[PDB]
């Protein structure tokens, strides 16, 4: 009846929720005994209300003006508190009066933004409240210091008994269980595989600590934690049941599954969606879950299941965005959606993708989405985040002290961030910092030479190359050259790229380099350092004329490896009969090897397979020697290249065409004997597969 009778109930069943900084909107259905629905857009719909509408009156009063003053001063303060709390969580109006809504999301946790230095300042500070200790423990846990976090959690849980607030006790116990689980899995994985992956045995935790934690929680179960809480905590805080077990992520994941199926069906059918689409719901739910789990200092964010959920949500959103840009015109689109408002990727989305993905998932995204067309906004914060990452890497790996525990939790984020930096614009000084961090101080164990060069080119793709980066690369290359002085310092790579590609990258943009340091190094080279002369032989274009003249003496003359290395730099332009003789010698040795293998039933596949370039030379009239025809039957590529009319086209693997340079593909479409057959395999592959490169080859050159 009276307005005071309305507002007192709301305070009575809302006010205890002030201990938490946030509650998700869809969780408010629990605190009202399932009476209403509170949608992810902030609107209100009634479900089981049969009596007076205690919900609608509050929004009626909020909209009204004079009714606000008709209450008492204490009730006016209560209304002010309720209004402030509701505005902080985004509940705007009700469905009947609902107009246009612009939900506000804002993560303020220092953990999300990765400002570790500020965390370091905060930690060395004397706490004045239990909440401060809880925050400090979480900051330590995110910082990798997994040992002291347990002690601070024990202290906060011991000192929280004599206080009328069970929320801190409950949350601290959940966090303690989580850190214990993480410690156990970490030590197990260490003692199992780190002796092989890292090269040594690493034991960050003393045996006493593991024994104590095992003794303390050998007999603890998580499902019955809430039932052991007092009845008041049973009653007021029913909004926190869903966090006790792992059923919460189950309930979110099933909803994501249903939404994903709906979105995929929508995409396949080619329909339109009015009102609220099925992807805005996913985005809002994802952001709500993120800020719930972050602002309230919940440790569940550093586990695999949360990563899977956020990964799937982002992948679905990006796929829908890519499909949106390439939809057909039909006869309805322009009137309803003109001047397409493309899905802009802001700083929050970039941080999410960088933190929660691995390299394989990003590559999978790149193979099925033209991610370079997507706009990238708010670039200053992207630059700040990237520079902070680079500085943290440099600081961590420059000193003698490396935190292995924090190394496992951080190296993936830095890896993914420096990979994804390809599609965004960078400042010059920031580019210098990032390139220095990627080249010098990034560990070699996890990142190889070829991977480093590929990453450097990826970062080069969007920004030009000024002189500072050239000097940085020159310094690292000189360091690598001088390190290659021990008799056993062989180099390895996963893509077979090595330092030759570094030289090529330098030469591609700037053309008249001198590199005085390398000239000084080579001028003092006397003799008897075979691998040292071989190393900078492939570095010849970056050397001086006098250095070149010095190097031409005691040169690795004509060996097949040396022949290919020298012809890859341009030292040899046209073949000589000696080169043909060496090619024939290699072919004859390979034929004897093939006879031996056939006797033994052995087949070999090599990344150093020179067997294929010989047919390439023969087909383009590089070599006029006519004794190649006797080596038919060794490898399929040789037969295809040299005898187009004799090769059986059934063996023609269609993955070969990807590696051909464009002028071959122009020349491959000139001879009659290779036009009737390659066309058919091209059509079959383009029809039965979604590879766009095959379509490009079929379209531009053959047709």
């Amino acid at each position: 009846t009276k307005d005071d009778e309305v507002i007192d109930y709301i305070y009575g069943k809302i006010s205890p929720l002030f201990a938490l900084q946030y509650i998700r909107k869809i969780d408010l259905k629990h605190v009202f005994e399932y009476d209403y629905h509170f949608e992810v857009n902030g609107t209100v719909v009634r479900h089981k209300n049969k009596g007076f509408g205690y919900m609608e009156r509050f929004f009626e009063l909020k909209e009204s003006c004079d009714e606000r003053s008709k209450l008492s001063k204490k009730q006016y303060e209560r209304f002010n508190a309720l209004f402030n709390f509701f505005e902080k969580n985004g509940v705007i109006c009700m469905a009947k009066d609902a107009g246009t809504l612009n939900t506000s999301i804002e993560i303020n946790s220092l953990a999300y933004h990765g400002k570790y230095d500020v965390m370091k300042k905060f930690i060395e500070e004397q706490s004045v409240s239990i909440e401060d200790d809880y925050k400090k423990a979480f900051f330590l846990a995110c910082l990798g210091r997994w040992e002291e976090s347990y002690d601070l959690y024990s202290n906060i849980i011991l000192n929280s008994i004599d206080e009328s607030n069970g929320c801190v006790y409950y949350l601290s116990q959940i966090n303690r269980y989580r850190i214990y689980q993480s410690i156990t899995q970490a030590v197990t994985q260490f003692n199992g595989l780190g002796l092989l992956t890292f090269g040594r045995h690493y034991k960050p935790f003393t045996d006493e600590f593991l024994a104590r934690i095992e003794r303390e929680m050998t007999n603890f179960n998580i499902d019955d934690l809430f039932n052991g809480m007092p009845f008041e905590f049973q009653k007021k805080y029913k909004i926190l049941e869903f966090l006790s077990d792992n059923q919460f992520l189950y309930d979110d994941t099933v909803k994501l599954f249903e939404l994903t199926n709906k979105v995929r069906s929508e995409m396949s059918e080619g329909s339109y969606s009015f009102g609220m689409s099925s992807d805005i719901v996913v985005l809002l739910r994802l952001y709500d879950n993120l800020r719930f789990l972050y602002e309230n200092c919940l440790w569940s964010v550093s586990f695999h299941e949360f990563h899977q959920y956020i990964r799937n949500s982002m992948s679905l959103l990006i796929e829908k965005a890519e499909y949106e840009r390439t939809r057909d015109i039909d006869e309805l689109g322009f009137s309803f959606f003109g001047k397409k408002s493309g899905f802009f990727m802001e700083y929050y989305d970039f941080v999410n993708i960088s933190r929660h993905f691995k390299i394989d998932d990003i590559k999978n995204l790149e193979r099925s989405c033209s991610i370079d067309k997507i706009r990238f906004g708010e670039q200053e914060k992207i630059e700040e985040y990237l520079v902070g990452i680079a500085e943290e890497i440099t600081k961590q790996f420059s000193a003698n002290g490396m935190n292995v525990v924090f190394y496992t939790q951080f190296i993936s984020e830095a890896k993914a961030a420096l990979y994804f930096a390809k599609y965004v614009k960078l400042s010059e000084e920031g580019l210098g910092k990032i390139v220095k961090a990627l080249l010098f101080y990034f560990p070699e164990r996890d990142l190889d030479i070829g991977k480093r060069y590929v990453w450097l080119e990826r970062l080069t793709k969007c920004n030009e190359l000024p002189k500072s980066i050239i000097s940085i690369i020159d310094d690292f290359l000189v360091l690598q050259a001088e390190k290659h002085i021990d008799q056993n310092y062989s180099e390895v790579s996963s893509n077979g790229l090595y330092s030759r590609d570094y030289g090529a990258l330098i030469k591609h943009f700037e053309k008249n380099f001198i590199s005085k340091r390398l000239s000084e190094i080579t001028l003092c080279l006397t003799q008897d350092k075979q691998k040292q002369i071989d190393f900078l032989f492939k570095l010849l274009p970056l050397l001086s004329t006098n250095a070149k003249s010095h190097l031409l003496s005691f040169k690795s003359v004509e060996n097949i490896n040396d022949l290919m290395n020298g012809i890859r730099i341009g030292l040899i332009d046209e073949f000589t009969p000696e080169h043909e003789e060496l090619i024939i010698e290699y072919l004859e040795t390979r034929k004897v090897n093939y006879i031996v293998e056939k006797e033994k039933g052995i087949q070999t596949f090599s990344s150093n397979d020179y067997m294929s370039t010989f047919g390439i030379w023969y087909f383009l009239e590089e070599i006029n020697n006519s004794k190649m025809e006797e080596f038919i039957g060794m490898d399929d590529q040789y037969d295809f290249f040299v005898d187009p009319e004799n090769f059986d086209y059934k063996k023609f693997i269609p993955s070969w065409l990807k590696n051909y340079n464009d002028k071959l593909l122009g020349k491959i479409a000139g001879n009659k004997h290779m036009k009737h057959h390659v066309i058919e395999v091209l059509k079959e592959r383009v029809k039965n597969s979604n590879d766009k490169r095959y379509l490009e080859i079929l379209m531009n050159y053959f047709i």
Binding site: L193, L196, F303, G496, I602, F605, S607, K658, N659
Partner: protein
């Protein structure tokens, strides 16, 4: 007996320059991937050469049953880059008889897996790990395959 159809495989690791048999054997998941790629890193050349090709090339691996060893593990507790050998059995479809064994060997292998499962519910062991096949500048490498069934 209605419709399931299953098979099996085997995995053997090795420490280079030594006779140390310290690893798993079964490879339940045992996914095996090949990928050849190229880009515009040669987008420009002085022309009239002969070629370089390149093709990058890289092959991945992943196996999981654990229980590596306890003797060689003990002696390692107190960087040859390792080598692997595969052993798989194939049957003739016409007769469905065990007649062929496949030998697959990779001379170099780089173990690099995400050292954080951090799954909320404790699993039944099976720490799945992946491998990358390293290649040098000398020759060969990658794969050597031997075929049985000389019947």
């Amino acid at each position: 007996m209605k419709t399931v159809i299953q098979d099996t495989a085997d995995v053997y690791f090795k420490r280079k320059s030594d006779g140390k048999l310290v690893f798993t054997a079964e490879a339940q998941t045992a996914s095996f991937s090949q990928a050849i790629s190229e880009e515009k890193l040669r987008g420009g050349i002085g022309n009239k050469p002969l070629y370089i090709l390149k093709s990058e090339k890289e092959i991945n691996l992943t196996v999981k049953n654990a229980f590596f060893d306890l003797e060689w593990l003990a002696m390692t507790q107190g960087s040859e880059r390792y080598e692997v050998e595969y052993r798989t059995i194939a049957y003739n479809p016409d007769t469905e008889e065990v007649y062929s064994d496949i030998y697959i060997q990779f001379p170099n292998v780089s173990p690099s897996g995400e050292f954080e499962m951090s799954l909320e519910n404790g699993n039944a062991l099976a720490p799945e790990i992946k491998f990358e096949a390293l290649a040098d500048t000398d020759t060969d490498e990658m794969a050597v395959v031997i075929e049985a069934s000389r019947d």
